[PDB]
Amino acid sequence: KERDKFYLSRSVVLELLQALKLKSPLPDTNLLLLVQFICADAGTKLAESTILSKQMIASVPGCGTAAMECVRQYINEVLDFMADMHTLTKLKSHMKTCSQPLHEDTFGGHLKVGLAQIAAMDISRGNHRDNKAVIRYLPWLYHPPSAMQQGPKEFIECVSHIRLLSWLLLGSLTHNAVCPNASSPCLPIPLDAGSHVADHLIVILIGFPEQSKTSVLHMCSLFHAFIFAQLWTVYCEQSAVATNLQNQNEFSFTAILTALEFWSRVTPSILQLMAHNKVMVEMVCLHVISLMEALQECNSTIFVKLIPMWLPMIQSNIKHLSAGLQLRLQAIQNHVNHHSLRTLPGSGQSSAGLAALRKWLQCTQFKMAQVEIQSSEAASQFYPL
């Protein structure tokens, strides 16, 4: 009987919806342990947390436990939790009933990714071939904000949209790090709409002269969304030579073409703002230098195809950068020239490459927790109403 075939995948999730709405009496050692259940259904594990010790998650299996058609109807509270910005300073304003002080800020990232890893599985069954998943709840991916309609309401719409997509990309990146054995191809942002996901950054690009000095969120919008380009690059790396479909090389070719159309739609407005002013060369190429440093950290084959499409155009006015940015640019260029010998994939180097990629994923996910919590806190400082 159906009430019993999905019985204990329903009794716990009614407290999960009220724990993610932050009203249940439960400690963080037992809060993520409830999300462990909905993650233990498809053979999956969550991200490495520091509020959980190394003796708690050492006895959890990944068996099929009837919790796959109980989260596709409760998938809208995932987008409700990750959609708004204000909940991450509300995490450290309700769960202060434990005496563990060193493990507070990083769970601000660990509860968004703990749902977004779950939202990377039921969407994929909707987004195998036809994409019936995202067109029912949040259809703005196929209907992008266009280039010449950028306003402040459109800015706070589009940066929340790109925060939704970057958190879902972080969830799928945790889903392809510890548990990369899913036969359902994880496609949150499909490449057929890849000509439209490039249009979601043109609003922040040309609107950034006019929508920057209102709050701190407006200022580091270019730091909330140019990590998203790195996440798109590593998602194209994980899905291009992927083992889910019959074709392995031409899918990689059209994934390379989609990544190149995204980069050539996001890059000329960055260079336009570079050519506008020379203090903008510092303020913008801080983000450009940090994203290419993350590209050096990940070492993707999309990055080496864009090495001479940036550096001869950037080094033509290299003397108008700031103090540390010149040293960082020369260090990244010398690491490129050193790693030009070291740009060749094999059969055993990708294991240590993905170990470094998941340690970097945990590090920059803690860094996204710090960036989002600082941005929300000093934006509530800028908006003390």
């Binding site: 989609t258 050539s264 080496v304 195809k305 001479p308 499409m309 001869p312 155009m313 030009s340 060749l344």
Partner: protein, 444 residues
């Protein structure tokens, strides 16, 4: 910005999931500004920004744009059908490439002599090592696509670059230019290091790299990253003529003397060659024809010339290097591969599905005392079965619940002969692992 908007428009249409009607309208605007420096018909912002930079800086800004254009056109030329007769626009584009790489050092000192010209070409090729990185990144699968008839005579100025794409000698470009200095990495060595990583290779490009390896060993004797680069083009769909010269190059690479000596380092490069040998012998069919693999004339003639005297000769020369660690390698081969591929490889080597046409006294090694025999162990079949039997028995003993079910029934016939072959032709190691427990707990 202005040249970086015009060429960005001429480049971004090629970098797309679909290619519109601008693939012919872009190569007209490439031999305009670069080949004969015509500035007419286009945007006047390009005419403003061309006279603020040098003639070389236009090449330095335009080379990766039309390089990604040519790479996205040659990767699409396989489907549209211009593999023998080239179009006009791609002819113009390759003429732009051979102007800005070969004829641009000519007029770069004419628009604005051996040592001063060397300093001038060093000033020209200051930041060239990032663009010749992309020159060998965006032509490595595209070597055999441009046929010699497809190579037009408008490209006859650029023969001296592409005729060294088939023999791989030193060409006449300064970005591609005494035993110790060959070990010092020049621009040519780092360029061919940046070249061999691409997929989609075939007979002419692999023969090009292999003739390069032959010329480099002839220059050297008269490092595992190039072994992994050979491995990236020796795990793909391998053919007959390429595995010929590949077995010749592993013959020439085993004799270098960089052998992992485990008997002379205790007082203070091999496994990948073995899996290339295993994939070559497996992919060349079985030695009598029953099983998977390449079937036809080329699959059959290379088991009595190339498996028998280019693969088994390599393994007989490889066994004369070390005597200890080959068992670990073939043990890792057993626990890495499934049942049917091991069946195919050992039918390609032993030939076990047909019965042993011998007599009933195949017991010439069948004693504990006679391990010192070097008849079949110096042959390849005995040493390979000796290094795989001690792990395949532990495999089938850990997988007892997989074989004795009748669903492997026809394959259950195969092993019904196979270990019998190891009973018949290899009774030495059969009797050895038959009573190795006394060597395990009573040789103390």
């Amino acid at each position: 910005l202005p040249i970086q908007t015009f060429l960005w428009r001429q480049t971004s249409a090629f970098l797309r999931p679909k290619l519109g009607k601008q693939y012919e309208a872009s190569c007209v605007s490439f031999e305009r500004v670069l080949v004969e420096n015509k500035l007419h018909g286009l945007s006047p912002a390009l005419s403003e920004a061309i006279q603020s930079i040098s003639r070389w800086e236009l090449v330095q800004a335009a080379l990766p744009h039309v390089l990604h254009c040519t790479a996205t056109l040659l990767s699409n030329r396989n489907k549209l059908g211009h593999q023998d007769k080239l179009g006009v626009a791609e002819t113009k584009l390759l003429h732009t490439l051979h102007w800005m790489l070969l004829e641009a050092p000519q007029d770069c000192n004419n628009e604005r002599s051996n040592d001063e010209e060397e300093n001038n070409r060093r000033k020209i090729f200051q930041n060239s090592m990032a663009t010749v990185e992309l020159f060998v990144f965006l032509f490595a699968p595209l070597v055999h696509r441009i046929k010699e008839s497809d190579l037009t005579f408008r490209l006859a100025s650029g023969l001296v670059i592409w005729q060294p794409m088939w023999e791989h000698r030193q060409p006449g470009v300064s970005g591609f230019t005494p035993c110790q200095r060959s070990r010092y990495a020049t621009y040519f060595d780092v360029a061919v290091l940046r070249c061999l990583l691409q997929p989609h290779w075939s007979e002419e490009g692999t023969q090009w790299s292999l003739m390069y390896y032959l010329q480099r060993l002839r220059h050297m004797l008269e490092l595992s990253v190039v072994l992994k680069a050979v491995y990236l083009v020796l795990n793909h769909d391998i053919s007959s003529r390429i595995c010929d010269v590949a077995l010749n190059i592993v013959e020439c690479l085993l004799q270098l003397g960089v052998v992992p000596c485990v008997e002379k380092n205790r007082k203070k490069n091999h496994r990948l060659a073995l899996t290339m040998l295993i994939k070559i012998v497996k992919s060349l069919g079985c030695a009598y024809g029953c099983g998977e693999g390449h079937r036809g004339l080329s699959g059959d003639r290379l088991r009595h010339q190339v498996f028998r005297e280019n693969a088994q000769n390599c393994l007989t020369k490889l066994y004369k290097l070390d005597k200890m660690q080959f068992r670990q390698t073939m043990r890792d081969y057993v626990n890495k591969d499934s049942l049917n591929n091991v069946v195919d490889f050992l039918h390609a080597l032993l030939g076990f599905c047909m019965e042993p046409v011998t007599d009933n006294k195949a017991g010439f090694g069948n004693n504990f005392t006679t391990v010192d025999n070097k008849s079949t162990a110096q042959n390849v079949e005995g040493i390979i079965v000796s290094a795989m039997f001690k792990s395949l028995i532990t495999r089938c003993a850990s997988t007892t619940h997989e074989l004795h079910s009748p669903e492997n029934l026809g394959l259950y016939c195969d092993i019904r002969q196979l270990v019998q072959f190891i009973k018949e032709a290899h009774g030495n190691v059969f009797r050895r692992v038959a009573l190795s427990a006394l060597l395990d707990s009573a040789e103390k």
